[PDB]
Design a protein around this ligand. Structure first.
Ligand code: NAG
Ligand code: NAG
Ligand code: NAG
Ligand code: NAG
Ligand code: NAG
Ligand code: NAG
Ligand code: NAG
Lengths: 49, 49, 49, 166, 201
């Protein structure tokens, strides 16, 4: 743990990236977090929204 | 680089302009083995109607 | 653009619509800009036979 | 029915197929055949319920008899079970990377070099560096002060009849 | 009677592989150290899924009945293991007052401690199971073990009540959040109920 600071820096960055990646799994109000499913399932007028 | 920087002249340096991505050469679709055919034979081929 | 359809198909004359008329007869763009006007013409286009 | 009847009086067998769709789970679907699978090539794939783009490779994992889709730590699909062949395929997303353009100032010259970041030189006077594939740069042994940084200790610059060197 | 459900009732919530990962998922689980009813063929509710467990030395317990009325008025699941053959039917069976065995059909299929999890979500009847040896009579064994999925019936019949066909234990799922530990081999080796205690929180 003596080198904590350095390790800490690394840790923080990783978490950030992880969080960013996890944001791809959120629907943000859409019907599905997967873009391909929305494209293939809905008609263009609503798939656009 | 000229267009990505919006200028007709570029200073010395290294710039990022686009992304190289290999495109998928063809498509593949995989589903389980087709079994359990609906018994349409028992209907269309019945001996008595 | 002038033509004649049946009443049930009037809904199909609109951007982002599907069906017989929309798919195979007259297709508007999804970003269509303009007006659609439809009126019954039973007195004019119908015949006893 | 007598066999000597005219067609209008001869018997015809009729079958009426009705297709009912209720608010209950569907149990009658059509074949939805499949095709062959290819490995070591970038493909757009659609397995049982999932779709994606990537390269399918022979795996090293031991999926359970009931497991279908892998998953990495960051909720990303990692491996799949082929529905027909009982083999587990790793999904490695197809190669990609930035295309950096190393240039001396256009004032001096118009010759340039191209660095494809983090790829082998096979998938594109070629230099394979830890930063990627560099094209148009003459690789020399003599060391000099860094002018245009590339990465991993490699720098490029325009030097003497004159050309770009890394 | 009542018994403690120490750490039992954890089942693979899907068919997704994960290695050396701590995953947080919310679903219907059996709360840790809760009460489970202990019996030595009463009809019980099926609120939101049922965890069922049996200790056997002579194969007394045979099958299950699920439904709403189970009196030939509406379809009802009947699952029976006749001594070599597993049979599942969903006919509108007319049941007896005490349907014991000697000491309109829309689907039909034919094929110590045992744990099963039956639940019904969006018209799908998930049946998870697990078998293990045991040397104990008077109570459930303390320990951890995961239940794999065995059957996913597309039956679509909504269930409210169920009954057994023959000591066993019955517990009722609740909508809790759990943390599951997947080892390198894809199997669940430990779980933490996220609402059990401050330390688990
Ligand atoms: C699926 O069918 C192919 C031939 O069509 C056969 O080689 C393969 O073993 C079958 N798979 C299963 C799981 O039955
Ligand atoms: C009836 O039998 C014939 C063989 O003579 C076959 O070609 C046909 O597919 C059968 N009908 C159906 C509906 O399968
Ligand atoms: C371009 O190069 C010329 C020498 O030919 C020099 O006089 C001029 O200052 C340079 N301009 C810039 C912007 O570097
Ligand atoms: C690039 O080539 C090296 C050896 O030539 C190989 O080990 C490496 O896996 C290749 N890169 C990729 C992305 O496969
Ligand atoms: C650089 O030196 C290596 C040996 O250290 C030699 O193989 C290579 O050909 C040399 N390249 C140039 C451009 O001198
Ligand atoms: C089980 O029931 C007893 C009384 O019947 C009660 O005291 C106890 O709190 C219950 N267990 C739990 C976990 O609530
Ligand atoms: C995981 O499986 C491999 C073989 O599939 C086995 O050698 C290994 O012991 C297993 N891991 C554990 C912890 O048992």
């Amino acid at each position: 743990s003596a080198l904590g600071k350095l390790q800490d820096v690394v840790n923080q960055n990783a978490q950030a990236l992880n969080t960013l990646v996890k944001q791809l799994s959120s629907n943000f109000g859409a019907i599905s977090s997967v873009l391909n499913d929305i494209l293939s399932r809905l008609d263009p007028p609503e798939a656009e929204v | 680089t000229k267009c990505t920087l919006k200028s007709f002249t570029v200073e010395k340096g290294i710039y990022q302009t686009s992304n190289f991505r290999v495109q998928p050469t063809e498509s593949i679709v995989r589903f389980p083995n087709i079994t359990n055919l609906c018994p349409f034979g028992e209907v269309f081929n019945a001996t008595r109607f | 653009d002038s033509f004649v359809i049946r009443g049930d198909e009037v809904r199909q004359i609109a951007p982002g619509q599907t069906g017989k008329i929309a798919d195979y007869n007259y297709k508007l763009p999804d970003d269509f800009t303009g007006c659609v006007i439809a009126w019954n013409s039973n007195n004019l286009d119908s015949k006893v036979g | 029915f007598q066999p000597t009847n005219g067609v209008g009086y001869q018997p015809y067998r009729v079958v009426v197929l009705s297709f009912e769709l209720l608010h209950a789970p569907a149990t009658v679907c059509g074949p939805k055949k499949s095709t062959n699978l290819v490995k070591n090539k970038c493909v757009n794939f659609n397995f049982n319920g999932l779709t994606g783009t990537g390269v399918l490779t022979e795996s090293n994992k031991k999926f359970l008899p009931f497991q279908q889709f892998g998953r990495d730590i960051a909720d990303t699909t990692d491996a799949v079970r082929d529905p027909q062949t009982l083999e587990i395929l790793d999904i490695t997303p197809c190669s990609f990377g930035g295309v950096s353009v190393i240039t001396p100032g256009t004032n001096t010259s118009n010759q340039v070099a191209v660095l494809y970041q983090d790829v082998n030189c096979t998938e594109v006077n070629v230099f394979q560096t830890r930063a990627g594939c560099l094209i148009g740069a003459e690789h020399v042994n003599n060391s000099y002060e860094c002018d245009i940084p590339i990465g991993a200790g490699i720098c490029a610059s325009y030097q003497t009849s004159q050309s770009i060197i890394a | 009677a009542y018994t403690n459900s120490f750490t039992r009732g954890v089942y693979y919530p899907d068919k997704v592989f994960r290695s050396s990962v701590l995953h947080s998922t919310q679903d219907l689980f059996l709360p840790f150290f809760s009460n489970v009813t202990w019996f030595h063929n009463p009809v019980l509710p099926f609120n939101d899924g049922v965890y069922f467990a049996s200790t056997e030395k002579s194969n007394i317990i045979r099958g299950w009945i699920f439904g709403t009325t189970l009196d030939s008025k509406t379809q009802s699941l009947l699952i029976v293991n006749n001594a070599t053959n597993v049979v599942i039917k969903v006919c509108e069976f007319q049941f007896c007052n005490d349907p014991f065995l000697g000491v309109n059909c829309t689907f039909e299929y034919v094929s110590n401690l045992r744990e099963f999890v039956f639940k019904n979500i969006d018209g799908y009847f998930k049946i998870y199971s697990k078998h293990t040896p045991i040397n104990l009579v008077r109570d459930l064994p303390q320990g951890f073990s995961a239940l794999e999925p065995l059957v996913d019936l597309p039956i679509g019949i909504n269930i409210t009540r169920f009954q057994t066909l023959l000591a066993y234990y019955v517990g009722y799922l609740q909508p809790r959040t759990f943390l599951l530990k997947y080892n390198e081999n894809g199997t669940i080796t430990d779980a933490v109920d996220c609402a059990l205690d401050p330390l688990s929180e």
